[PDB]
Design a protein around this ligand. Structure first.
Ligand SMILES: Nc1ncnc2c1ncn2[C@@H]1O[C@H](COP(=O)(O)OP(=O)(O)OP(=O)(O)O)[C@@H](O)[C@H]1O
Ligand SMILES: Nc1ncnc2c1ncn2[C@@H]1O[C@H](COP(=O)(O)OP(=O)(O)OP(=O)(O)O)[C@@H](O)[C@H]1O
Ligand SMILES: Nc1ncnc2c1ncn2[C@@H]1O[C@H](COP(=O)(O)OP(=O)(O)OP(=O)(O)O)[C@@H](O)[C@H]1O
Ligand SMILES: Nc1ncnc2c1ncn2[C@@H]1O[C@H](COP(=O)(O)OP(=O)(O)OP(=O)(O)O)[C@@H](O)[C@H]1O
Ligand SMILES: Nc1ncnc2c1ncn2[C@@H]1O[C@H](COP(=O)(O)OP(=O)(O)OP(=O)(O)O)[C@@H](O)[C@H]1O
Ligand SMILES: [K+]
Ligand SMILES: [K+]
Ligand SMILES: [K+]
Ligand SMILES: [K+]
Ligand SMILES: [K+]
Ligand SMILES: [Mg+2]
Ligand SMILES: [Mg+2]
Ligand SMILES: [Mg+2]
Ligand SMILES: [Mg+2]
Ligand SMILES: [Mg+2]
Lengths: 342, 342, 342, 342, 342
């Protein structure tokens, strides 16, 4: 029997979107090889340093309960992505924000948001089918090293260590990670491989451990499903698969167009983090052949297959699906009910 | 034991009607195939998204106690409808709001509210009788699939899986709904039928669980009693039977007119949620034959039975019965006693 | 479920830097033979007077959480330095302040802070390599007395008693120091050598105990690893190594220049605390021969090894490594999450 | 005598850039043929509806004195542009905001804002010289008709009436526009051409008054100096001029690149107000043939001069000059002194 | 009459020094060829942008009366410098600030601030005697051009035009400056020469004519008395004249030391504003040859008289005298009384 506050329509949608945008910015700053970090205040002592997107998402709550609803929903998106794969939480968050934003923009009296959500789901199914079609399997230790290096912010040593551990204990053997008291990283087997991470301080060790865990999750996903073009170009090459779709009604077309517009968000964010204009980069990615992407680290155009800029199919698929499933549902909102602050 | 504030007559009635209007609008935004959802903040964790009238009604409260009284009465309407039939709580809420508003409008110095209550109960019994008269028994599993699809907001897969479970376990069997961890809905029998609803997150799986529970309850009511016209056309065709009823006095005439103008509310709300004027649609429905109605999804006029838009008799009869039984009693209030805030 | 406030980019960086500056000044008013002490209030009783960097660092906590974050990070620098070397906490803190300040100064839209951090790590690795190259082993108890006297703020009796105790018990023996109930320091062996610290009050004996503990830790570090030029001249002589580095991209250039400009900080601050202009002293140190440094106590440019102004190699390398590892990580921060002050 | 408030560096820089951003955004929303109207409340009577850049600029005032400083500087830019040409105040506003932002971004400890301003002046001189070099004189009444129509938000009747007035009075004749009292425009000469605006209310008449005055000033400037490519394409085609410039040192290069990025702002803003992305439109204009630009109404790429989209050379050159001269001076600011509000 | 507030000694000195330092920094930020401009809010209209020291000095008033006292005293320094020479107001500002600081620190219970002032006066008269014995008469129109260029922020056109005007109307002839209407400045004689300063907006012509006025005053002083080394170098070179002085008492020695340390402040400030450190640069200037000075524009050491960076003897000597006379008297203050704010 607690007093509640009721908001209708556009005010509620805008108040959701404010929190969604705040959390999505705070997460998306940590995207890509040029991405930066986030300092999170800790109550029990030293603040923690995390480039990990889902930690940034889960570490943010907003006083306004209306904005807190959207913040907690994008937090749920990121948490589901982490629970399913363990990487690409930033990509899932930016996709969720973009889908929710485009859904809120195209809301009117005549627009049926439920059929828009149905169209979003249909387009997501089609693009996941295209993703599985385009993916290729892993057949080389060099590919494992590349996956672990790209997943760990370009740390060649971490990629080499993970590749060595996978070679030593097999691609299915158990590997864990724990902090080492040394200044460098060492691998020992006593089998089951255990990775000991070195660093000059607890915060640096924690950050490197997060990167190592991300790389390990990505390489396990790669061996489980396969790899696709990295740098967000997998979505940018699956985009034509939506043009072959024939929507049933208008709202289906609205959903398909919204998903097609959101497909280029990850490449836009990756380019934007590297001090350049995202839209031109996405345009040139699409104009290029099916084997050319933008190397965000070096700031030029290369062949991603040769350069080792690749990502697992599982990460991108789960990120896109988890973002769509929650963002489209939030789009169907008309009334929000929050508890009055006491 | 505590100080109480007392209000007399019209001001108190308006104060209660304010809360009834707030709750009724916040629930009626979720009526019809083109209806939308309501976001409800949950203290322990992720906010929930629902398209169910009873939960939205139960998840609201107001600081003002005079409004909260009407809010609690209409909450009782929705809860009793859900407990008795498991479906049609939003229709119960809108009928309760309509009856309460009409009763409050037609109160004068000489008008006896109790005899208006007697007249409205007489009219409700009459329309229940004619609703039973125009009922149709369920004889094919195709009608089962149609009822399940209609009750689940135009979901073909939910209706098909409900029909398959109905065919396998038997019409009078036992069905239990549990949330599956997969991305697809699965049916298993081990026999007791079990539906494993699937989704990519907790909010989607909870919403789909609500929809499948509504479909199950609607189909069970259909097999128990029968089916009548969908889209609010059952009451809309029971309307012309009130002209055959004569009141004993003027108050019963007022109550009969209250039911007469109330029976149009579900169709008007269904049309209005589709972004169109309800009144013209309802007038064309009356002008049309005894079988033609308005399909709110396709936005045209079709033979309701042949297009599968059908509805259980029990749901409508109990929703109208309970909404009347509570709102009419709310009409007869003159003095209201509420506690002083502490 | 606690609400947080998010600050982006330059404002958050400046807010952290203000707290870093406050704590670093409060710590850096101490180091050098002419440095001053700090009075820290003790709630349970008499206050404490200390000339030790880590005590000042730990004892200082700020109100605003954005300043408190930088305060806790420089606290981590000081504590890690104290735990790994037992000396040079003030040097580590001033190096952390300088690295963080310079890195924040060079943060731009077109800059990649992660590659700046990589360049910083390469520069500190080269510097520590040259520092190890320039180390000298300990062969005489005279060098032991010199190290003890230098790390005891020029107290000759402490150095003499430490050298005599290490002569009696051995250079790898077990020495512990405790308070003395007489008016002077006395050494007793029973075996494990025990030092009793004399004084007329709790504050005097506590400060002398801290100084003699610093002397013991520095002397043990010297006997384990070696000694180098004191007065910060080790890093000044290590400066030329960085000029031979040929990094890859501009961000590594920036990081290497950060380290090169940070190497001058200890000598500059030691000179500044003496009452003279630090920059002129440090420049005259660079121009002079490899064996000539500035005697802050005497205010003259003298032979460092002949005068006996020497410091352990392990202490200097530990301080520099910890300061780099923490401050450079703090450099790469753009988004900051802090709890609301409930 | 009056107590003053002083701020240093980046804090005040961001403070007045906030006001510059606010005023320039309010001005820019009205740019292009798809720009909208700004409603300004009037103390005397009915609020006015305006599409005029300098009017909105002068109508923007802020309580914050630091933001008000930048607001009044951009007001000064718009006012000087209106005084010297009477058209293109929106272009001057957006160019000035772009230059102020770019100058504020690229300020460091060693950066020299004054020499950056000198380089901005050098680039401005080069762009103005190339505007003169590519300028084409007006030879037929169709061209002045097109210029009047384009400057009148594509009002064909306004341009036709102005062309008739010009052909009846002459290229150098005196034309004045006065308030009209009927519903249709009428041109009469009693000599001096006088135009009466046809409107239905005061505010509509004022809006068309602004439009017709802008069109008349556009015709006067076009016949004074000449015509170049419209739609902001002149600066895009003049961009290659800066490629041949050799800066004296780094600061002039910074200014040259600031102007180079700024030269794309008008076309980008015209595209953005059309509802599409501006960067890709600008890039397509730059890649495509020099004689083909972007049309905002049809949203396609056609020949600008053949389609009538042309601008007076005087208008664009004075907009660029007035914007740059004050924005680059705003860049040089380091300390800001304001009065304490009282 | 009205109630007063009285403060004794050190706290009052610190409060005054706070405002002195604030205004001194706000003035000295502009100093040097690489200095930046100050924005001062104007209540009557457009804000002003200036690079002149005395305008910023006059335009700053402080809420605290104790700080305002020192602010007004250094304002007196600036105004006296402007009224006597019209140039070098920032030099006098920084000299007075340094003298105030060094007199505020070097005061003890047994010291005699009156005798300290007398020693300061003796040092200053010796310094001005050395300056007059180190001057060189202007015997070349090219020298006039160099002086005009250097005193006008190194603008070649302004210096050349001033040289041409002085050649046309005679060295002692009258020159007047007024703002023009076109974009470039012109000189005309009808004799009396009028310099029509050109520009784009009000702020540009205002600060341009301020710079031209400063250059004209410097030129007049150069013709009247002579020229000396620029960049504060002559004050550096006159320090050895102080070393020959034997103070009568200890406090005269204190004052001589104060002036001796102060004599380096202008060069330090010029170097500091140039993005480089100042102490080592001025030390290298003292070490280098007599004619060698630091060219802060090119960032190197050159024979400065040959490069044309020259300053008038009268400007330098008057600035130093006006700074010293006020500051050495200010340091003598022990008790300050103020009015109670109301
Ligand atoms: N040098 C590079 N050039 C282009 N794309 C790159 C480069 N390095 C990494 N990427 C891509 O950028 C993304 C890496 O982003 P990032 O590591 O910040 O977050 P994430 O993978 O979404 O997940 P998480 O937030 O959990 O780390 C991946 O899609 C990866 O393929
Ligand atoms: N496609 C359709 N066109 C027209 N009317 C429809 C259509 N589908 C369902 N209806 C009608 O709309 C109503 C369904 O309302 P809704 O699904 O919002 O909830 P409800 O039946 O009131 O109850 P609950 O909220 O418990 O599910 C029924 O009267 C049904 O007959
Ligand atoms: N007499 C001296 N002359 C010159 N340099 C000295 C002298 N004594 C110490 N130093 C230098 O000062 C630094 C030592 O500083 P100090 O003893 O105050 O504390 P610390 O080692 O920085 O740390 P902590 O305060 O935790 O003990 C070293 O760089 C050392 O070489
Ligand atoms: N149909 C069009 N296609 C392309 N560019 C157009 C079109 N119509 C106008 N423009 C361009 O838009 C600009 C005109 O902007 P607008 O009419 O908003 O006012 P303005 O000239 O900027 O000045 P003010 O706001 O003071 O009237 C010019 O650069 C013109 O070339
Ligand atoms: N290019 C230069 N190289 C070296 N010193 C220079 C250079 N330009 C100017 N200076 C020195 O800097 C000072 C000139 O500073 P500035 O013109 O900003 O103000 P000012 O002389 O203090 O006074 P005012 O504000 O009245 O002009 C002089 O000491 C001059 O010698
Ligand atoms: K991330
Ligand atoms: K419903
Ligand atoms: K110390
Ligand atoms: K406009
Ligand atoms: K100046
Ligand atoms: Mg990642
Ligand atoms: Mg229902
Ligand atoms: Mg020490
Ligand atoms: Mg215009
Ligand atoms: Mg000057």
């Amino acid at each position: 029997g607690s007093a509640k506050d009721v908001k209708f329509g556009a005010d509620a949608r805008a108040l959701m979107l404010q929190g969604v945008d705040l959390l999505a910015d705070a997460v998306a700053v940590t995207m890509g090889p040029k991405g930066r970090t986030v300092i999170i205040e800790q109550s029990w002592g030293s603040p923690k340093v995390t480039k990990d997107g889902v930690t940034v998402a889960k570490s943010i709550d907003l006083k306004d309960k209306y904005k807190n609803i959207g913040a907690k929903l994008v937090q749920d998106v990121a948490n589901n992505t982490n629970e399913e794969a363990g990487d690409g939480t930033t990509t899932a968050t930016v996709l969720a924000r973009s889908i929710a934003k485009e859904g809120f923009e195209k809301i009117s009296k005549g627009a049926n948001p439920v059929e828009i959500r149905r169209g979003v789901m249909l387009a997501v199914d089609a693009v996941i089918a295209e993703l599985k079609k385009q993916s290729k399997p892993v057949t080389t230790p060099e590919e494992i090293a590349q996956v672990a290096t790209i997943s760990a912010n370009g740390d060649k040593e971490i990629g080499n260590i993970i590749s060595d551990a996978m070679k030593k204990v097999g691609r299915k053997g158990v590997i864990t990670v724990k902090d080492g008291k040394t200044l460098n990283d060492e691998l020992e087997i006593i089998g089951v491989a255990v990775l000991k991470v070195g660093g000059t301080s607890d915060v640096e060790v924690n950050e490197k451990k997060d990167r190592v865990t991300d790389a390990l999750n990505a390489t396990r996903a790669a061996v489980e499903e396969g790899i696709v073009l990295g740098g967000g170009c997998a979505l940018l090459r699956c985009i034509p698969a939506l043009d072959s779709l024939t929507p049933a009604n208008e709202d289906q077309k609205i959903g398909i167009e919204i998903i097609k517009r959101t497909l280029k968000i990850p490449a836009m964010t990756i380019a934007k983090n590297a001090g350049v204009e995202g839209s031109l980069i996405v345009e040139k990615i699409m104009q290029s052949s099916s084997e050319v992407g933008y190397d965000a680290m070096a700031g030029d155009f290369v062949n991603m297959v040769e350069k080792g800029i690749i990502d697992p199919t599982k990460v991108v698929r789960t990120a896109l699906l988890d973002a769509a499933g929650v963002a489209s549902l939030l789009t169907t909102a008309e009334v929000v009910v929050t508890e009055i602050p006491k």
